Enzyme design. Structure first.
Site, PDB file in Angstrom:
ATOM      1  N   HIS A 186       0.430  -1.433   0.310  1.00 51.32           N
ATOM      2  CA  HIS A 186      -0.077  -0.123   0.048  1.00 51.32           C
ATOM      3  C   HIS A 186       0.905   1.287  -0.070  1.00 51.32           C
ATOM      4  O   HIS A 186       0.516   2.674  -0.405  1.00 51.32           O
ATOM      5  CB  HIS A 186      -0.869   0.198   0.606  1.00 51.32           C
ATOM      6  CG  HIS A 186      -0.750   0.125   2.305  1.00 51.32           C
ATOM      7  ND1 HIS A 186      -0.428   0.469   3.323  1.00 51.32           N
ATOM      8  CD2 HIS A 186      -0.531  -1.163   3.477  1.00 51.32           C
ATOM      9  CE1 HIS A 186      -0.075   0.151   4.563  1.00 51.32           C
ATOM     10  NE2 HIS A 186      -0.117  -0.800   4.387  1.00 51.32           N
ATOM     11  N   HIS A 195       6.027   6.564   6.215  1.00 48.11           N
ATOM     12  CA  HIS A 195       5.641   5.922   5.575  1.00 48.11           C
ATOM     13  C   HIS A 195       5.076   7.455   4.359  1.00 48.11           C
ATOM     14  O   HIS A 195       4.787   8.807   4.928  1.00 48.11           O
ATOM     15  CB  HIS A 195       4.964   5.292   5.099  1.00 48.11           C
ATOM     16  CG  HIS A 195       3.665   5.421   6.708  1.00 48.11           C
ATOM     17  ND1 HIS A 195       3.644   5.098   6.974  1.00 48.11           N
ATOM     18  CD2 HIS A 195       2.586   6.432   5.297  1.00 48.11           C
ATOM     19  CE1 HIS A 195       2.726   5.759   8.105  1.00 48.11           C
ATOM     20  NE2 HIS A 195       1.617   6.347   6.617  1.00 48.11           N
ATOM     21  N   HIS A 239       1.662   9.312   1.874  1.00 53.48           N
ATOM     22  CA  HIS A 239       0.963   8.672   1.000  1.00 53.48           C
ATOM     23  C   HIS A 239       0.597  10.365   0.183  1.00 53.48           C
ATOM     24  O   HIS A 239       1.158  10.821  -0.019  1.00 53.48           O
ATOM     25  CB  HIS A 239      -0.387   9.256   1.859  1.00 53.48           C
ATOM     26  CG  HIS A 239      -0.760   8.511   3.004  1.00 53.48           C
ATOM     27  ND1 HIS A 239      -1.847   7.064   2.876  1.00 53.48           N
ATOM     28  CD2 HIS A 239      -0.370   8.304   3.902  1.00 53.48           C
ATOM     29  CE1 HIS A 239      -1.077   6.875   4.357  1.00 53.48           C
ATOM     30  NE2 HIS A 239      -0.165   7.231   4.498  1.00 53.48           N
ATOM     31  N   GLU A 256      -3.735  13.569   2.517  1.00 54.44           N
ATOM     32  CA  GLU A 256      -4.912  12.520   3.557  1.00 54.44           C
ATOM     33  C   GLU A 256      -6.142  14.028   4.064  1.00 54.44           C
ATOM     34  O   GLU A 256      -7.096  13.944   3.990  1.00 54.44           O
ATOM     35  CB  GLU A 256      -4.151  11.954   4.969  1.00 54.44           C
ATOM     36  CG  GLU A 256      -3.448  10.228   4.019  1.00 54.44           C
ATOM     37  CD  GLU A 256      -3.950   8.527   4.839  1.00 54.44           C
ATOM     38  OE1 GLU A 256      -3.669   9.191   5.079  1.00 54.44           O
ATOM     39  OE2 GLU A 256      -4.392   8.430   3.018  1.00 54.44           O
ATOM     40  N   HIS A 263       3.910  10.530   7.228  1.00 52.49           N
ATOM     41  CA  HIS A 263       3.882  10.428   8.355  1.00 52.49           C
ATOM     42  C   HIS A 263       4.690   9.106   8.927  1.00 52.49           C
ATOM     43  O   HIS A 263       5.335   8.735   8.772  1.00 52.49           O
ATOM     44  CB  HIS A 263       2.602   9.648   8.743  1.00 52.49           C
ATOM     45  CG  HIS A 263       1.780  10.250   7.542  1.00 52.49           C
ATOM     46  ND1 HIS A 263       0.060   8.793   7.143  1.00 52.49           N
ATOM     47  CD2 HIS A 263       1.137  11.111   7.971  1.00 52.49           C
ATOM     48  CE1 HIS A 263      -0.993  10.585   6.722  1.00 52.49           C
ATOM     49  NE2 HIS A 263      -0.209  11.653   7.051  1.00 52.49           N
ATOM     50  N   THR A 317      -5.229   6.220   9.500  1.00 50.78           N
ATOM     51  CA  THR A 317      -5.306   6.409   8.806  1.00 50.78           C
ATOM     52  C   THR A 317      -5.422   4.696   7.536  1.00 50.78           C
ATOM     53  O   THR A 317      -6.500   4.929   6.374  1.00 50.78           O
ATOM     54  CB  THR A 317      -5.385   7.525   7.031  1.00 50.78           C
ATOM     55  OG1 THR A 317      -3.537   7.445   6.230  1.00 50.78           O
ATOM     56  CG2 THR A 317      -4.904   8.345   8.590  1.00 50.78           C
ATOM     57  N   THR A 318      -5.003   3.862   7.603  1.00 52.84           N
ATOM     58  CA  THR A 318      -4.869   2.667   7.294  1.00 52.84           C
ATOM     59  C   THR A 318      -5.620   1.829   7.982  1.00 52.84           C
ATOM     60  O   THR A 318      -5.696   1.581   8.869  1.00 52.84           O
ATOM     61  CB  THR A 318      -3.937   2.055   6.906  1.00 52.84           C
ATOM     62  OG1 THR A 318      -2.613   2.353   8.081  1.00 52.84           O
ATOM     63  CG2 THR A 318      -3.449   3.045   5.884  1.00 52.84           C
TER      64      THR A 318
HETATM   65  N1  LIG Z   1      -0.712   6.048   7.397  1.00 54.25           N
HETATM   66  S1  LIG Z   1      -1.510   5.481   8.924  1.00 54.25           S
HETATM   67  O1  LIG Z   1      -0.239   6.341  10.104  1.00 54.25           O
HETATM   68  O2  LIG Z   1      -2.256   5.919   9.588  1.00 54.25           O
HETATM   69  N2  LIG Z   1      -0.945   3.438   8.578  1.00 54.25           N
HETATM   70  C1  LIG Z   1      -0.185   3.285  10.141  1.00 54.25           C
HETATM   71  C2  LIG Z   1       0.010   2.428   9.663  1.00 54.25           C
HETATM   72  B1  LIG Z   1       1.439   1.149   8.551  1.00 54.25           B
HETATM   73  B2  LIG Z   1       1.429  -0.091   7.760  1.00 54.25           B
HETATM   74  B3  LIG Z   1      -1.001  -0.180   9.423  1.00 54.25           B
HETATM   75  C3  LIG Z   1      -0.426   0.871  10.123  1.00 54.25           C
HETATM   76  B4  LIG Z   1      -0.649  -1.077  10.844  1.00 54.25           B
HETATM   77  B5  LIG Z   1       0.666  -1.334   9.052  1.00 54.25           B
HETATM   78  B6  LIG Z   1       1.841   0.088   9.605  1.00 54.25           B
HETATM   79  B7  LIG Z   1       1.841  -0.307  10.917  1.00 54.25           B
HETATM   80  B8  LIG Z   1       1.512   1.349  10.067  1.00 54.25           B
HETATM   81  B9  LIG Z   1       0.032   0.694  11.305  1.00 54.25           B
HETATM   82 ZN   LIG Z   2      -0.035   7.111   7.251  1.00 56.31          ZN
END
Ligand SMILES: [N]S(=O)(=O)[N][C]C123[B@]45[B@@]67[B@@]89[C@]1%10B81%11B698B746B814B562B%10%1143
Ligand SMILES: [Zn+2]
Length: 258
Positions: free
Chosen positions: A62, A92, A94, A104, A117, A196-197
């Site tokens: 992703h 990471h 987006h 986002e 982020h 956000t995921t």
């Molecule tokens: N866009 S975000 O920072 O909210 N995503 C957080 C994540 B990344 B991907 B999915 C969520 B879990 B794995 B790894 B771990 B960290 B946490």
């Molecule tokens: Zn993120």
């Protein structure tokens, strides 16, 4: 049929596996700059990344994560709205298919080309997996990217992306200094939200910097050459891996600045 960003598995679908998607403190949100209130109670923000130890970069299908050794207090975020010490675990991005979208968070509905982020966990909870189950478990520092001049401190990231084109690929990524991704000003907005995921957990204090960093068209074009698919599968470019703004509900966005 795993979650992702397409028509059939995108943000509009996530609530079926992750009902918290329609929860009371989801992220991202639009930041309405006129309604955000200056908060004199916020202490100064402290971003201490001098001792950060990067380990690896990974295409997780992703996005890509730049991972850090978080086994001791090296790179920490403190102050601002935060109580205690939050340790950097990874960062990471987006981003969009076009420079007019990708972020986002939005600012008065403006979308930036991308959003970085930097993810940190509250050390009072001992590890990331425990921290994500707590309302104050994580602090995510969000930085907007606009297209203009190149960000030199990003180029090391850009130049390794060829080696992790497809889902599951990783590469050694030591000695990367995340200080090179920060804008001049640490003026920010802050609010309580979520990942956000998926799993969309409601465990994040969001700290979104007002000042974007500029990156070059060439830099962002290299992000868009990544693939969502794994090696040897039909190519699906890794673009538009952003969730849109969610309902603010019963929340106030606070500004660190007048
Ligand atoms: N866009 S975000 O920072 O909210 N995503 C957080 C994540 B990344 B991907 B999915 C969520 B879990 B794995 B790894 B771990 B960290 B946490
Ligand atoms: Zn993120």
């Amino acid at each position: 049929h795993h979650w992702g960003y397409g028509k059939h598995n995108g943000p509009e679908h996530w609530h079926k596996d992750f009902p918290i998607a329609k929860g009371e403190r989801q992220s991202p949100v639009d930041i309405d700059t006129h309604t955000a209130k200056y908060d004199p109670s916020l202490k100064p923000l402290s971003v201490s990344y001098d001792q950060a130890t990067s380990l690896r970069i990974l295409n997780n299908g992703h996005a890509f994560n730049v991972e850090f050794d978080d086994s001791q207090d090296k790179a920490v975020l403190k102050g601002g709205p935060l109580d205690g010490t939050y340790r950097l675990i990874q960062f990471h991005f987006h981003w969009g298919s076009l420079d007019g979208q990708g972020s986002e968070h939005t600012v008065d509905k403006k979308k930036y080309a991308a959003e970085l982020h930097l993810v940190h966990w509250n050390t009072k909870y001992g590890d990331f997996g425990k921290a994500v189950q707590q309302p104050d478990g994580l602090a995510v520092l969000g930085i907007f990217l606009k297209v203009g001049s190149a960000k030199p401190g990003l180029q090391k990231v850009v130049d390794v992306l060829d080696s992790i084109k497809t889902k599951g690929k990783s590469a050694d990524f030591t000695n990367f200094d995340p200080r090179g991704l920060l804008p001049e000003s640490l003026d920010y907005w802050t609010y309580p939200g979520s990942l956000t995921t998926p799993p969309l957990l409601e465990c994040v204090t969001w700290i979104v910097l007002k000042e974007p960093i500029s990156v070059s068209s060439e830099q962002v074009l290299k992000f868009r050459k990544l693939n969502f698919n794994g090696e040897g599968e039909p190519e699906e470019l890794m673009v538009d891996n952003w969730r849109p703004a969610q309902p603010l509900k019963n929340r106030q966005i606070k500004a660190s600045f007048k």
